[PDB]
Write a protein that binds this ligand. Structure first.
Ligand SMILES: CCCCCCCCCCCCCCCCCC(=O)OC[C@H](COP(=O)([O-])OCC(O)COP(=O)([O-])OC[C@@H](COC(=O)CCCCCCCCCCCCCCCCC)OC(=O)CCCCCCCCCCCCCCCCC)OC(=O)CCCCCCCCCCCCCCCCC
Ligand SMILES: CCCCCCCCCCCCCCCCCC(=O)OC[C@H](COP(=O)([O-])OCC(O)COP(=O)([O-])OC[C@@H](COC(=O)CCCCCCCCCCCCCCCCC)OC(=O)CCCCCCCCCCCCCCCCC)OC(=O)CCCCCCCCCCCCCCCCC
Ligand SMILES: CCCCCCCCCCCCCCCCCC(=O)OC[C@H](COP(=O)([O-])OCC(O)COP(=O)([O-])OC[C@@H](COC(=O)CCCCCCCCCCCCCCCCC)OC(=O)CCCCCCCCCCCCCCCCC)OC(=O)CCCCCCCCCCCCCCCCC
Ligand SMILES: CCCCCCCCCCCCCCCCCC(=O)OC[C@H](COP(=O)([O-])OCC[N+](C)(C)C)OC(=O)CCCCCCCCCCCCCCCCC
Ligand SMILES: CCCCCCCCCCCCCCCCCC(=O)OC[C@H](COP(=O)([O-])OCC[N+](C)(C)C)OC(=O)CCCCCCCCCCCCCCCCC
Ligand SMILES: CCCCCCCC/C=C\CCCCCCCC(=O)OC[C@H](COP(=O)(O)OCCN)OC(=O)CCCCCCC/C=C\CCCCCCCC
Ligand SMILES: CCCCCCCC/C=C\CCCCCCCC(=O)OC[C@H](COP(=O)(O)OCCN)OC(=O)CCCCCCC/C=C\CCCCCCCC
Ligand SMILES: CCCCCCCC/C=C\CCCCCCCC(=O)OC[C@H](COP(=O)(O)OCCN)OC(=O)CCCCCCC/C=C\CCCCCCCC
Ligand SMILES: COC1=C(OC)C(=O)C(CC=C(C)C)=C(C)C1=O
Ligand code: SF4
Ligand code: F3S
Ligand SMILES: [K+]
Lengths: 106, 86, 172, 158, 164, 69, 82, 117
């Protein structure tokens, strides 16, 4: 065939797959699994995700509370100021802004 | 063929009257939430004379006034930029 | 103009052959499990039972409600249409009929029945002042409450009973 | 009155500390190119031009100065954002082509109904995949904040 | 079939009878009914065949299997003809044009008189091949030919029983 | 202002039920959820031909012809 | 246009012609396969996503609450906003 | 709208339980009835998930007091809070004056597990 015969032969062995070649049991199981995903799995994932959000944000918040108790300070704004935009209220973010101010200003 | 009392023309006006009001409100609420964030991050602050303001800035930030290209972006907007920025 | 979205045979004369075939499909004749015993008079029906069939037995098959439904415009050969569906409810509501479950099982199809989206054009244009839309809503509620897993087998058994029927639309 | 947009404090620090230029990688280039333009009715967010400047600077990886550390953290947050933009185009392309091939034998109405929705879904799926593989889902709130700090700010006198 | 599951003759009879009535009861005319169901029917039919192989000569199970095979044959054959009819009618609808106006109209089948002679022959062949499935053949192919008749005036034996 | 313990189970559970209830309702209860099935059934189903030209087939075919398969 | 006039229609379940009904069944499988694959997106988000304010959080737990049992005095105003 | 009836309504617990059980015992021989098995099973699988969440937050409660801000009656106030923040620049024009230095106090605490003193 030549180089063309090698080009055509390779595409014939690369484009060989079809769903008509699949066995009967696997053909149905793929449909069953897909239908199970849409009906059962898809609605559950959002709920499992809410559980983890709460648990992970509970860890983030109690760590601030642990820090304040160890510090024995009632200067709440030092730990988290709720009047500052975005996430800047957190003590660490406030310190980052302070570093920026000190370096930039003379 | 074409009639004003047609199902097409009366379903297109009904949809407009029904949805356009809801939509305008909905988009507006998003636009409002955007402004609330923007005004808390970089509120537009009006200065009298741009030249004096620029000097105070260069002095406050320790920037050499020679290396800063000041350009007028709009009639009411000027902009200082680094001239030696990669 | 001729009836909407119909094949025009000539000028204002529509082609309503599909409508006639769909009606033959619902088999609009009384069915009973036991043949009238010799020496028997009329099958008993109360005035109240006869009242149930009031607004449904007056349909003159004008086919206006049919050619006013946007769902019959789009899927004429799959959706039975308002008039046929009301006639099916007439025979599902007739106390004398004894094949209520068979009729409900056959009509319980996505294309045959649930293509009605409640446009209400059928009730607005009815020349006899009937309410096909209300009847279809009742028939959908009755089917939903009475559905059983064995309905599909019931349809199959009736189909076997019609094996020797002639060539034309029929229960199957 | 007159407004004056000046480099922000983070920009000032980044310019002071830049040690050299930084080679932009191939995916960063493509990500910046595939990034939608931003119309600045008011200036509060970073655009593709500001992001390039951040990624074109180079900082000392060992420097222990707290200021330099902030700059490096910001540059890393900007990099994850930029390379994440490379997933939108693949998603939108497959989100139209695959549906169109499947409905290729169906009427025009069906393509008008389906293709617009699958396109947005494919683009969304691509964006999710890109942001996920760029490690945006594991960034802390401090990392994301530093990467979102504006590069231009209206000057506040006094 | 490759399986380790074992079933009694009573269980085999139940599975086969369930599949037979399920297929014969499903509405064949609606394409989505066959497209969605046939994958499940084929998986079940393979299992039914494996467990009913001993009972092919059984006086109860044997007839059920034979009817089940015949129904599946009729289901595939009828679906094929109606699929072609659906192709012809959709070619005709596209020829009408956008909004029925004819604006962006496709070219219109030219051998439509001959394509209707092909379908009607197939319809009659199905009737002879599957004599105990006429109700299903009329539901799918018969009604399909009645729809075509509204577009092209052609003659078939049962045309009068379809109000033509 | 300085309680020894804080009761969070009631509030958290209330939020879980409200959020979960709204999402599960939207996904399961309404018949609107089958609106994409109705639209497809009405306008897309049984409307296909293999004897009419379409761009995706033409594109794949030409690109193959161009590369000699 | 024109259409083939010598079609060999299916005769039984084992002598089948390729038609658009069989193509539609392949579409059902391929669309369902996509659904199985796209489930990996939402599942991956829930597994890999972390909601933490900074790197401090983990250090606080390693040095102050290693067993997740240490009790912190509660000052309501801190998180109540007032 | 909708499709042909495939099973019981959602509120019919005993009927749905039957279909959910058949998902494991009797294989489906049609798409409609397989889909019904999933929907009826979805009722119980989703109920179980919500159930565990509620159980887990009672048996192992959240320790922070932030969740008091997630009370239903406080939801409106929180919405107004995000729309009524003071306008300004995120950057600090002037040093913040706090009675405590959390950054420094945190450095010492992480190093010695002891306050600076
Ligand atoms: C306990 C018992 C309880 C009762 C029974 C429970 C099961 C029944 C449930 C109800 C019926 C469901 C049904 O119909 O069955 C579905 C189906 C079986 O159907 P069937 O028709 O009855 O089977 C007969 C067929 O002939 C066989 O079916 P088939 O072959 O046609 O297809 C089955 C297929 C099911 O899947 C499919 O058919 C679909 C496949 C994918 C389709 C394409 C998807 C495309 C999308 C991609 C997605 C990802 C993208 C990500 C992108 C990012 O199975 C697989 O997934 C296996 C495929 C791979 C084969 C092996 C090839 C590699 C070489 C060998 C590797 C060996 C390594 C082993 C590692 C072991 C590690 C410990 O699946 C199974 O049930 C088989 C499961 C096989 C794996 C099981 C492994 C775990 C076993 C233990 C579980 C229990 C743990 C208990 C622990 C203790 C707890 C306290
Ligand atoms: C490794 C190297 C690459 C190997 C490629 C192998 C391809 C192959 O074997 O194809 C076999 C396949 C043979 O199988 P068959 O069952 O006979 O199918 C024939 C047709 O494909 C019939 O196709 P159809 O009409 O049934 O529609 C196909 C479509 C059916 O599904 C759809 O049409 C809907 C797809 C989703 C729509 C929503 C858009 C979502 C887009 C997401 C994009 C990604 C986002 C995340 C990632 C972002 C970037 C990082 O299938 C899928 O998209 C399913 C994908 C399942 C993936 C499971 C893992 O042959 C072809 O695909 C040839 C068709 C001609 C080219 C079509 C080009 C379409 C546009 C690309
Ligand atoms: C904006 C982003 C979204 C854009 C669209 C995304 C498009 C890609 C979707 C990819 C996911 C897989 C899609 C289905 C795969 C096929 C499964 C299948 O065959 O099942 C039987 C399938 C029906 O499946 P089913 O699960 O038994 O019943 C669905 C019910 O929802 C009852 O099911 P259920 O009880 O489980 O109810 C759960 C319900 C829960 O429902 C909802 O979540 C509510 C929203 C429903 C409508 C939302 C869309 C409204 C826009 C117009 C939709 C129609 C235009 C087409 C859209 C694209 C369709 C691919 O979820 C669903 O609707 C099912 C999940 C997949 C839906 C995908 C399309 C809508 C996504 C909407 C996401 C955003 C919604 C926001 C709504 C606004 C308010 C927040 O029936 C057919 O196949 C009918 C075909 C008729 C025409 C003939 C076609 C050829 C036949 C050969 C096979 C064709 C297969 C492919 C069909 C699609 C071709 C375009
Ligand atoms: C144990 C008993 C069980 C009883 C079960 C009863 C369940 C039903 C009651 C409703 C519970 C759901 C409450 C909502 C979730 C908690 C609220 C929350 O997180 O907000 C706080 C968060 C708090 O964040 P924060 O950062 O402001 O909190 C800090 C507050 N300061 C500053 C004062 C310290 O609010 C916000 O962030 C503002 C936006 C809130 C937007 C709320 C939108 C409503 C969401 C629910 C929609 C429900 C849809 C269904 C109804 C249909 C409507 C058409
Ligand atoms: C035929 C009918 C069939 C009915 C099937 C009913 C299925 C019920 C589905 C339950 C799913 C629950 C999953 C919750 C996932 C979310 C929670 C999460 O992420 O938490 C992380 C948690 C861990 O997080 P944590 O925060 O709890 O961790 C603290 C806990 N300690 C201190 C112990 C570490 O782990 C899990 O996800 C575990 C979840 C266990 C779920 C167990 C469910 C069993 C269901 C049995 C049903 C039996 C039905 C019988 C039918 C009979 C028919 C004849
Ligand atoms: C026709 C009808 C027209 C209707 C038009 C009006 C409609 C809209 C009305 C106004 C709605 C306003 C909603 C405002 C919501 C804002 C909530 C918000 O900011 O959420 C983020 C908020 C906190 O914000 P930050 O302080 O920036 O913290 C960042 C991380 N440290 O995060 C949360 O706690 C979100 C909680 C979500 C819980 C849901 C379950 C998961
Ligand atoms: C034809 C052949 C098609 C081959 C497609 C291969 C697709 C692979 C997709 C996953 C790759 C993810 C990846 O590289 O993520 C890492 C990388 C970040 O890690 P780094 O720190 O830069 O380097 C890691 C090692 N130090 O993540 C990203 O680049 C962010 C996400 C980018 C967007 C998504 C990917 C875009 C480019 C590939 C598109 C492929 C499309 C394929 C379509 C096929 C259709 C049939
Ligand atoms: C819904 C489950 C079933 C899904 C089935 C289809 C699968 C394919 C389509 C995608 C499904 C949904 C995927 C969900 C997971 C991915 C979510 C995602 O990428 O969100 C982006 C991002 C995640 O936040 P990051 O801070 O970047 O990282 C989080 C961890 N720190 O989300 C957001 O910030 C979104 C905030 C809420 C926006 C709400 C807009 C209005 C409502 C839109 C939906 C209707
Ligand atoms: C007569 O032309 C047309 C059809 O044929 C009956 C349609 O199906 C439909 C109906 C389809 C949709 C998407 C509403 C339209 C709009 C159309 O123009
Ligand atoms: S329009 Fe009224 S009278 Fe005429 S067929 Fe319909 S229901 Fe009967
Ligand atoms: S107009 Fe049609 S959609 Fe129903 S309410 Fe009447 S039969
Ligand atoms: K009756």
């Amino acid at each position: 065939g030549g180089i063309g015969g090698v080009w055509r032969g390779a595409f014939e062995v690369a484009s060989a797959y079809t769903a008509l070649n699949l066995e009967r049991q696997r053909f149905a199981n793929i449909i069953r699994l897909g239908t199970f995903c849409r009906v059962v799995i898809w609605p559950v994932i959002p709920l499992v995700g809410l559980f983890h959000y709460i648990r992970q944000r509970d860890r983030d918040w109690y760590a601030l509370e642990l820090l304040r108790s160890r510090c024995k300070s009632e200067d709440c704004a030092a730990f988290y100021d709720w009047t500052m935009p975005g996430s800047s209220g957190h003590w660490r973010m406030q310190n980052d802004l302070e570093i920026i101010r000190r370096a930039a200003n003379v | 063929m074409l009639r004003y009392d047609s199902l097409l023309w009366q379903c297109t006006l009904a949809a407009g009257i029904w949805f356009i009001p809801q939509d305008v409100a909905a988009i507006s609420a998003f636009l409002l939430y955007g402004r609330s964030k923007s005004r808390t991050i970089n509120q537009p602050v009006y200065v009298d004379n741009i030249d004096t303001a620029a000097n105070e800035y260069f002095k406050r930030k320790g920037l050499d006034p020679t290396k800063m290209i000041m350009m007028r972006k709009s009639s009411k907007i000027t902009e200082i930029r680094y001239g030696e920025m990669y | 103009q001729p009836l909407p979205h119909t094949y025009v045979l000539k000028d204002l004369v529509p082609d309503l052959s599909n409508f006639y075939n769909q009606y033959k499909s619902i088999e609009p004749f009384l069915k009973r499990r036991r043949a009238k015993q010799p020496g028997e008079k009329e099958y008993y029906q109360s005035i109240e039972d006869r009242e149930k069939l009031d607004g449904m037995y007056e349909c003159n098959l004008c086919a206006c409600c049919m050619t006013s439904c946007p769902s019959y415009w789009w899927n004429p050969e799959y959706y039975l249409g308002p008039a046929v569906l009301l006639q099916a409810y007439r025979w599902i509501a007739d106390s004398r009929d004894e094949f209520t479950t068979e009729r409900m099982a056959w009509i319980n199809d996505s294309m045959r029945l649930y293509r009605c989206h409640g446009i209400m054009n059928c009730t607005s244009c009815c020349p006899k002042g009937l309410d096909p839309a209300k009847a279809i809503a009742k028939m959908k509620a009755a089917i939903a409450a009475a559905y059983e897993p064995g309905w599909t087998k019931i349809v199959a058994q009736e189909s076997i009973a019609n094996k020797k029927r002639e060539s034309g639309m029929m229960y199957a | 009155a007159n407004l004056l947009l000046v480099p922000s404090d983070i920009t000032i620090i980044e310019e002071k500390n830049k040690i050299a230029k930084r080679r932009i990688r191939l995916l960063e280039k493509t990500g910046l190119a595939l990034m939608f333009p931003v119309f600045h009715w008011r200036y509060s967010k970073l655009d593709k031009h500001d992001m390039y400047n951040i990624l074109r600077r180079k900082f000392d990886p060992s420097a222990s100065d707290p200021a330099i550390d902030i700059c490096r953290r910001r540059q890393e947050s900007v990099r994850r954002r930029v390379i994440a933009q490379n997933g939108l185009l693949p998603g939108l392309l497959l989100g139209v082509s695959l549906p169109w091939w499947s409905l290729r034998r169906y009427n025009y109405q069906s393509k008008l109904i389906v293709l617009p929705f699958c396109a947005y879904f494919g683009a969304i799926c691509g964006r999710i995949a890109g942001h996920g593989l760029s490690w945006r889902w594991v960034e802390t709130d401090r990392q994301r904040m530093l990467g979102n700090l504006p590069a231009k700010v209206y000057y506040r006198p006094k | 079939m490759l399986t380790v599951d074992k079933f009694t003759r009573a269980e085999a009879l139940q599975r086969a009878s369930n599949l037979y009535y399920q297929v014969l009861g499903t509405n064949w005319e609606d394409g989505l009914n066959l497209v969605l169901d046939v994958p499940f029917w084929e998986s079940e039919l393979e299992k039914v065949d494996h467990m009913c192989e001993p009972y092919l000569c059984d006086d109860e199970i044997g007839p059920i299997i034979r009817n089940l095979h015949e129904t599946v044959n009729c289901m595939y054959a009828c679906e094929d003809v109606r699929d072609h009819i659906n192709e012809l009618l959709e070619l005709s609808s596209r020829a009408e044009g956008v909004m029925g106006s004819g604006a962006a109209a496709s070219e219109e089948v030219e051998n439509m008189p001959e394509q209707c002679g092909m379908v009607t022959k197939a319809y009659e062949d199905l009737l002879a091949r599957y004599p105990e499935h006429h109700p299903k053949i009329e539901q799918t192919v018969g009604h399909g030919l009645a729809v075509l008749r509204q577009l092209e005036k052609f003659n078939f034996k049962s045309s009068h029983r379809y109000f033509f | 202002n300085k309680p020894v313990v804080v009761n969070t189970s009631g509030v958290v559970n209330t939020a879980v039920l409200g959020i979960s209830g709204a999402w599960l309702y939207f996904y399961c209860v309404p018949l609107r959820r089958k609106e994409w099935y109705d639209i497809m059934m009405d306008y897309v189903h049984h409307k296909r031909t293999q004897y009419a030209s379409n761009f995706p087939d033409k594109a794949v075919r030409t690109a193959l012809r161009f590369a000699k398969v | 246009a024109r259409v083939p006039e010598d079609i060999e229609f299916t005769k039984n379940r084992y002598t089948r012609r390729y038609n658009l009904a069989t193509e539609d069944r392949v579409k059902l499988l391929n669309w369902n396969a996509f659904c199985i694959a796209v489930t990996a997106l939402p599942i991956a988000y829930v597994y890999y996503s972390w909601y933490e304010s900074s790197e401090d959080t983990d250090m606080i737990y390693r040095t102050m609450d290693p067993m997740r049992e240490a009790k912190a005095d509660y000052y309501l105003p801190l998180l109540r906003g007032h | 709208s909708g499709n042909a009836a495939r099973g019981p309504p959602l509120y019919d617990l005993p009927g749905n339980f039957r279909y959910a059980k058949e998902f494991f015992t009797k294989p489906a021989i049609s798409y409609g009835e397989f889909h019904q098995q999933c929907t009826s099973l979805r009722l119980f699988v989703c109920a179980g998930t919500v159930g565990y969440m509620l159980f887990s937050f009672t048996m192992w409660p959240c320790r922070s007091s932030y969740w008091k801000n997630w009370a239903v009656w406080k939801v409106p106030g929180n919405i107004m809070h995000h729309f009524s923040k003071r306008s300004g620049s995120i950057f600090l024009d002037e040093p913040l004056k706090r009675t405590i230095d959390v950054p420094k106090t945190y450095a010492h605490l992480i190093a010695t597990r002891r306050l600076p003193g």
